[PDB]
Amino acid sequence: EDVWEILRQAPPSEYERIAFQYGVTDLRGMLKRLKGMRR
Amino acid sequence: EDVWEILRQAPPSEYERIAFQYGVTDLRGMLKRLKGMRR
Amino acid sequence: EDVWEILRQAPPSEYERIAFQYGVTDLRGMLKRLKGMRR
Amino acid sequence: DDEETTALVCDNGSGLVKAGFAGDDAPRAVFPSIVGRPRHQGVMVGMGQKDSYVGDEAQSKRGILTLKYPIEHGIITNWDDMEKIWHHTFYNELRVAPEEHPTLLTEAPLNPKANREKMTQIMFETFNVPAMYVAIQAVLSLYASGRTTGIVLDSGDGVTHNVPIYEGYALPHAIMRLDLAGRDLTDYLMKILTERGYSFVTTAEREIVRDIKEKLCYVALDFENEMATAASSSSLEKSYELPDGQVITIGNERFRCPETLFQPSFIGMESAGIHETTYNSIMKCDIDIRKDLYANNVLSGGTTMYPGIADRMQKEITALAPSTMKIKIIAPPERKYSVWIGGSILASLSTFQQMWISKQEYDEAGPSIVHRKCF
Amino acid sequence: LMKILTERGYSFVTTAEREIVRDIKEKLCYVALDFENEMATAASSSSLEKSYELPDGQVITIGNERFRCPETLFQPSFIGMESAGIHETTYNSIMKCDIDIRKDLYANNVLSGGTTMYPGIADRMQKEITALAPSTMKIKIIAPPERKYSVWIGGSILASLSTFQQMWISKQEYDEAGPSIVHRKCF
Amino acid sequence: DDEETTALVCDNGSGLVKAGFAGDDAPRAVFPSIVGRPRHQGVMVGMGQKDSYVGDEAQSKRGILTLKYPIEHGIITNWDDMEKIWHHTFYNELRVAPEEHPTLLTEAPLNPKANREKMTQIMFETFNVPAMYVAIQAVLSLYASGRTTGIVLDSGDGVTHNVPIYEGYALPHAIMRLDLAGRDLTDYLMKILTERGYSFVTTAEREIVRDIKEKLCYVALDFENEMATAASSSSLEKSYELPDGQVITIGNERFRCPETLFQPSFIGMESAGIHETTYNSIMKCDIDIRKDLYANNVLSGGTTMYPGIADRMQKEITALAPSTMKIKIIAPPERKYSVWIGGSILASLSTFQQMWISKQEYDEAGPSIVHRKCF
Secondary structure (H helix, E strand, O other), X not given: OOHHXXXXXXXXXXXXXXXXXXXXXOHHHHHHHHHHHHX | OOHHHHHOOOOOHHXXXXXXXXXXXXXXXXXXXXXXXXX | OOHXXXXXXXXXXXXXXXXXXXXXXXXXXXXXXXXXXXX | OOOOOOXXXXXXXXXXXXXXXXXXXXXXXXXXXXXXXXXXXXXXXXXXXXXXXXXXXXXXXXXOEOOOOOOEOOEOOXXXXXXXXHHHHHHHHOOOOHHHOXXXXXXXXXXXXXXXXXXXXXXXXXXXXXXXXXXXHHHHHHHHHOOOOOOEEEOOOOOXXXXXXXXXXXXXXXXXXXOOOHHHHHHHHHHHHXXXXXXXXXXXXXXXXXXXXXXXXXXXXXXXXXXXXXXXXXXOOOOEEOOOOOEEOOOOHHHHOHHHHXXXXXXXXXXXXXXXXXXXXXXXXXXXXXXXXXXXXEEEOOOOOOOOHHHHHHHHHHHHOOOOOOOOXXXXXXXXXXXXXXXXXXXXXXXXXXXXXXXXXHHHHOOXXXXXXXX | OHHHHHHOOOOOOOHHHXXXXXXXXXXXXXXXXOOHHHHHHHHHOOOOOOOEEOOOOOEEOXXXXXXXXHHHHOOOOOOOOOOOOHHHHHHHHHHHOOOOHHHHHHHOEEOOOOOOOOOOHHHHHHHHHHHHOXXXXXXXXXXXXXXOOHXXXXXXXXXXXXXXXXXXXXHHHHHHHOOHHHHOOOO | OOOOOOOEEEEOOOOEEEEEEOOOOOOOEEEEOOOOOEOOOOOOOOOOOOOOOHHHHHHHOOOOEOOOOOOEOOEOOOOHHHHHHHHHHXXXXXXXXXXXXXXXXXXXXXXXXXXXXXXXXXXXXHHOOOEEEEEOHHHHHHHXXXXXXXXXXXXXXXXXXXXXXXXXXXXXXXXXXXXXXXXXXXXXXXXXXXXXXXXXXXXXXHHXXXXXXXXXXXXXOOOHHHHHHHHHOOOOOOOEEOOOOOEEOOOOHHHHOHHHHOOOOOOOOOOOOHHHHHHHHHHHOOOOHHHHHHHOEEEEOOOOOOOOHHHHHHHHHHHHOOOOOOOOEEOOOOOOOHHHHHHHHHHOOOOOOOOOEEHHHHHHHOOHHHHOOOO
């Protein structure tokens, strides 16, 4: 998927954007799981 | 009173109305007496 | 005032103008009163 | 039953329709441009309720009936309603035969031609007036000014524009549009009243709120300083008996409602406020017309009835206009009916029948005629 | 009231007893404008002890019940209805009303019912509203003496509305449209 | 007794209050927002009945106690009840020290500022949480969408609105209000059940009827055709055991209850149905945002759990929207808890403590601070 890697690599401002383009519509998700790491 | 005359002269739709303005609150009345004629 | 006399004497084209210079800003007026005569 | 005739000075004021005879001192008819649909339409002994005789009757006996403007946004979407409206006009408070008397009609700029086309032929046919004529409400108010030169901020019934002029000479390039209307401030203030812990959605609520404006709302010359006051300005908390009966409290909204006519950000228009629209129209003006414009800063509209509106003008321009030139905004107390007064004078211009839209000219030239070389 | 009469040392269960007690109401029971003050009176209000010949013949004694029976139409707690009294039902209906219909409602506070024949019922209306309605508005409750038969009078007038046969449920209309017709577009 | 902290994602869902920790997969607490008054309050040996521990206990042991929402109409009229409600929350099913954990709070649009003012200081004082933060339930569900663009029909717990968006960009001018609520459909269906030969007035009856809805009531794509069916549609007469025990019969009401969210005439709201509210919000939108809106037609609400609701969307728009554009309504199965999920994510936004309403900021800036430049 690389959404893990690229949404821990992309901008944050654009973490929003590119979770929404690079397949993580649940940027909601991406952050909650990024947090499951840092939650 | 003229309620007799004007409630046999006014509109019918507005016989209601003008019995209620020109003093025959008993439009109820006005019709029952109009009928005492035509009852 | 003479606006009556000079706005019944001045040009008409310039009745506009000279009502607006000779004091009848209400040329609007001057005509409506000229009409109160001819209204 | 009298001599030749007297014109029918009739205004379709954006909110209310107003009219009188030629050279009358006041349009004898004025009332909202509403259409009424009784919501539940209860069945009772007999009848007595007409659908849409709204005129002035409906709002008093409002609620069941909803509200409708044929001319909703200064432009009319329905007419059957609307011609029956004029019938109410000419036969209930004009109570007159249109065929009897010539009538001048009010048409706003930017109208598609077909609008006046139809309004014409329908008035001819249904009303068979001797004939008619029409004119721009803005232009009619402008003759009501008599100020041949200068721009007019025609923020009156339900519209806003600028009318730069000189000796009666106005530039269509120099005239712009403002969708802002009493309806717009209505929506904004209703919004604010609701958000402050209130349920302001209902039609009669809409009329009530506009009245709340017209008798309460003002505008503050300064914005932030007066808003800081409102932080503790114990003057401005005048609460007004909600017409249902419970006093409705009021604070800074009593002013910060209409200023958005200068800042449409809160109302959400990219458009620029009235003042800078006037100013940029000024810049597009020629070199020295502008001093006159300053002196001919003729305001117009009862919607603009707010206190310090003119003063806010002079100050805002000052911030804009060079101090070298001197600014003089005009604003008659008789601004909303000034349009009808100018119409009465012009139609009364018995030296000016020649511009009149007659039976024949129309018939031979159909509807299109009134548009070519005439209006 | 049958409950209360029984609990006060009486055996009020029988049908004819039921009619008797309703009559006891209709000719005796009233309502007091004030509740607690009139109940404190009843603690010693020597006026209200009017005892009425039980129609069998022995005078049945009466006290504060002569009023505190129907007030529960305002307080259904004692009758045990979560529902709110007549007055506040009217009032909240008022609130749901539009803005200014309410002044008329105040003036058009038309009461109805012979069951509501009680004394001071209307006055209790105005006062309770007052406690509820803003003093800004003026309250006018209506209540004809002819309220229970007013329904029949209105029926007589309307049916008598010889301009109004057209709404009439006839043989044919019914038959062709069966029973359902009377319900659609008519009643 | 652990590391730094985890947020307190707490929702005051209009009907039920729901909450969990930061980044929880489900708000661990959910129950009605009812207050209970035992009607007759019988005297027995000892006690054991608290007045208003309603939570989830009361309704099971309902009847004596009546029902009360502090937030009755999405807006709270009483709070003592309500803060004790949150105490029940944080110490009976949150059973946690508020001081321990940060909490994000749900606030609906159009609230008077003082509401969140107090909710704040009371939570600070009584709950002394490390600090708090609040957000619009609509907005939180909107982040729960992740759909940066498009409008959301936030007809969820007990409210209805439209939330036009683009890349997270929503217009307050483009957002409206709908008083319609599960309570409203409740009153309507209770009315209908009663009028059909039934006595449906009681509170527990109220809960029963809402449940009757949630497990039975649906909506038909077509209205008149499905009503003509109901004239003889022998499918729809499913009668359901009244929970007291006698099967309660059901017919066309199983659908024609909620459609009034499109037609408030029968429920008696001049307001227009959800669909055309969305549509006119669409028109007020810019030119081409609307295709996205069509594709971003994100529905929200478990109240909207009805079958064919989305399909009725597409068809009604179709009747409204040009066929040129393509309509795509969204509606997650997880719509009512989607708000809490978005809250959990956002509060969990450990990159986003900075927006947090802390002790000091509040104290030095009092209550007003949380409102200026923050929420």
